[PDB]
C-alpha cells in the first residue's frame, strides 16, 4: 500500500496542465491525427474500384 502512497505524493508534486495550454495540445494532436487518418482512409477508398477496373 506504500507504493500507492509514494505514487500519490509524486503526482502531488507533478505539474498539472492548465486549460489554455490544454486547448493548444488538443488542437495540435487532433489535427495531426485526423489528417493522418483521413489521408489513410481516402487512399484506401480510391483504390478499390481502380483495382477492380485494372485487374
Amino acid at each position: 500500500v506504500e507504493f500507492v502512497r509514494e505514487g500519490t505524493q509524486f503526482l502531488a508534486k507533478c505539474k498539472k496542465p492548465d486549460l489554455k495550454e490544454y486547448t493548444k495540445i488538443v488542437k495540435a494532436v487532433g489535427i495531426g491525427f485526423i489528417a493522418v487518418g483521413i489521408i489513410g482512409y481516402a487512399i484506401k477508398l480510391i483504390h478499390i474500384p481502380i483495382r477492380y477496373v485494372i485487374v
Binding site: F3, E6, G7, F10, L11, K13, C14, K15, K16, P17, E21, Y22, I25, V26, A28, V29, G30, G32, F33, V36, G37, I38, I39, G40, Y41, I43, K44, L45, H47, R51, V55
Partner: protein, 430 residues
C-alpha cells in the same frame, strides 16, 4: 570492417525549416500508402500486394543490431567518426541480404505457385519495393522529415484502421437486408430510411454484431483522457556551474518508458498464447498440457492461458471475478517491472543522468553536488514504475470498455504525434 559503395541520401548542410519538413513528411507518407494497395502481377491485410515484406525486416535488422550493441560485442566507441559509419553500413548490408532471403523464402514456399521469368519478375518486384521503402525511411530520418519513418508508418496504420472501423462503406447483407459496417454511416442511414426513430436509435446504438456509436463515443473519451494525462511531468530547478547566470528546469514526464513495456508485454502474451495453442494442437490431452490449459470455443478453459485472457466486456468481468482480480494485478505488475528493467538497461538510470550532470556541470538550485544521485534515486524509479502501471491500467480499461481499437495502439499513435508536436514547438514554427 570493409569498403562498400551503396545508395544513400545525403543530409542538408544547413538546418531545414519547418514547412519543407512538413511537406516532405506528407509526400513520403502518401507514397508509402499508395505503394501498399497495388497488387502484384504474376500471381494467379497487406498480404498479396506490392508491400508483402513491409518494414518488418528493417525492424528485425535494427533490433538485432541494437541487441548486439547492448550486449557489448561490437566495442562501440563514440570517440571515432569511423565506427559509426561502419555500423551504419553494416545495418544496410545485412538488411539487404536478409530481405533477399525472405523474398526467396516467400517466393519458393508461398501460395504464388511452384511453376521461371515469372518468378524472376516476382522477386524483382518485392526487391524494388523493399529497396524504395528503405530509401524512404532513410530520407525521412536524415533530417528532411519531422521524425522517424517506422513510427510514422505505425501511427498511419492505426489511424487508418480507426477510421475505417467508423466510416466504412462496405455493406454487409445477411438475410435481414443491407447493413453498414461504419458507425456514423449506419446511424445516419437508420435515422433517414427506417422512419421508426424510437426503435432505430436503440437498434443502431448497440449492434452486438457490428461497430456502433457507443464505441465511437468511448474511443473519443479515451483519446481525450490520454491527451490530458500526457502533459504530466516532474520539474526540478537546475543551474549551471561552468558559466554563471544560466538557470534552467529539467522536466521528468510521467510516460517515461514511452510505450515500450506495453509492447513487450503484448508480444510475450501473444507468443505464449501461440505456443500453448500449438502444443495443445499437437498433443490432444496430457497431464501438463491439460493443466496449463483446456482450449475450447478459440478460448482456453480452466487453464492459465485462460486466466491471462483479456476481458472483452463487463459480462465476463462480472462472470468470474477471480480471473479479473488475478489478470489485472498480473498485467499491472508486469508492466511495472518491465518499465524498471527498461530504464535500467536503456542507459536512463539515475546514475547516468547524474554523470551527465557532472559532465555538463549542471547542479540543483538549492542543493549540494554530492547528493544528485541520491535525489535522482528518489525520483526516477518511482516515476518509471508508476508510468508502467498507468499504461497497464489504461490498456485494461480500453480492452474492457471495447473501443474501436486496442489501447496500446492509440497510446503509441498519440505518443508519436505528441513527440512530433513537442519537437515542433520547442524549435518554434507554424
Amino acid at each position: 570492417p570493409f569498403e562498400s559503395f551503396l545508395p544513400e541520401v545525403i543530409a542538408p548542410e544547413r538546418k531545414v525549416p519547418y514547412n519543407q519538413k512538413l511537406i516532405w513528411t506528407g509526400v513520403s507518407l502518401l507514397i508509402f500508402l499508395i505503394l501498399g494497395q497495388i497488387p502484384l502481377y504474376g500471381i494467379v491485410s497487406n498480404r498479396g500486394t506490392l508491400l508483402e515484406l513491409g518494414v518488418s525486416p528493417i525492424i528485425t535488422s535494427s533490433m538485432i543490431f541494437q541487441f548486439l550493441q547492448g550486449t557489448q560485442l561490437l566495442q562501440i566507441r563514440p570517440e571515432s567518426k569511423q565506427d559509426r559509419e561502419l555500423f551504419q553500413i553494416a545495418q544496410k548490408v545485412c538488411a539487404i541480404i536478409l530481405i533477399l532471403g525472405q523474398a526467396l523464402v516467400v517466393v519458393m514456399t508461398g501460395n504464388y505457385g511452384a511453376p521461371l521469368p515469372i518468378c524472376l519478375l516476382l522477386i524483382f518486384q518485392l526487391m524494388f519495393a523493399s529497396l524504395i521503402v528503405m530509401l524512404l525511411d532513410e530520407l525521412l530520418s536524415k533530417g528532411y522529415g519531422l521524425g522517424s519513418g517506422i513510427s510514422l508508418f505505425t501511427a498511419t496504420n492505426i489511424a487508418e484502421q480507426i477510421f475505417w472501423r467508423a466510416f466504412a462503406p462496405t455493406t454487409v447483407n445477411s438475410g435481414r437486408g443491407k447493413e453498414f459496417e461504419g458507425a456514423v454511416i449506419a446511424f445516419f442511414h437508420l435515422l433517414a430510411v427506417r422512419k421508426d426513430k424510437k426503435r432505430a436509435l436503440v437498434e443502431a446504438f448497440y449492434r452486438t454484431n457490428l461497430p456502433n456509436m457507443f464505441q465511437v463515443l468511448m474511443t473519443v473519451a479515451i483519446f481525450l483522457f490520454v491527451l490530458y494525462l500526457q502533459g504530466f511531468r516532474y520539474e526540478l530547478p537546475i543551474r549551471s556551474t561552468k558559466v554563471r547566470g544560466q538557470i534552467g528546469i529539467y522536466p521528468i514526464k510521467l510516460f517515461y518508458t514511452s510505450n515500450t513495456p506495453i509492447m513487450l508485454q503484448s508480444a510475450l502474451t501473444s507468443n505464449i498464447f501461440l505456443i500453448s495453442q500449438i502444443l495443445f494442437q499437437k498433443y490432444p490431452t496430457n497431464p501438463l498440457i491439460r493443466l496449463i490449459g483446456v482450449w475450447g470455443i478459440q478460448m482456453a478453459l480452466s487453464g492459465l492461458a485462460y486466466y491471462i485472457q483479456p476481458l472483452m466486456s463487463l459480462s465476463e468481468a462480472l462472470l468470474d471475478p477471480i480471473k479479473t482480480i488475478v489478470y489485472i494485478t498480473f498485467v499491472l505488475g508486469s508492466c511495472a517491472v518491465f518499465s524498471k528493467t527498461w530504464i535500467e538497461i536503456s542507459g536512463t538510470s539515475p546514475r547516468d543522468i547524474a554523470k551527465q550532470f557532472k559532465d555538463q556541470g549542471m547542479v540543483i538550485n538549492g542543493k549540494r553536488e554530492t547528493s544528485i544521485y541520491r535525489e535522482l534515486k528518489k525520483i526516477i524509479p518511482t516515476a518509471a514504475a508508476f508510468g508502467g502501471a498507468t499504461i497497464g491500467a489504461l490498456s485494461v480499461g480500453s480492452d474492457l470498455l471495447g473501443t474501436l481499437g486496442s489501447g496500446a495502439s492509440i497510446l503509441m499513435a498519440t505518443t508519436t504525434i505528441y513527440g512530433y508536436y513537442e519537437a515542433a514547438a520547442k524549435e518554434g514554427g507554424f
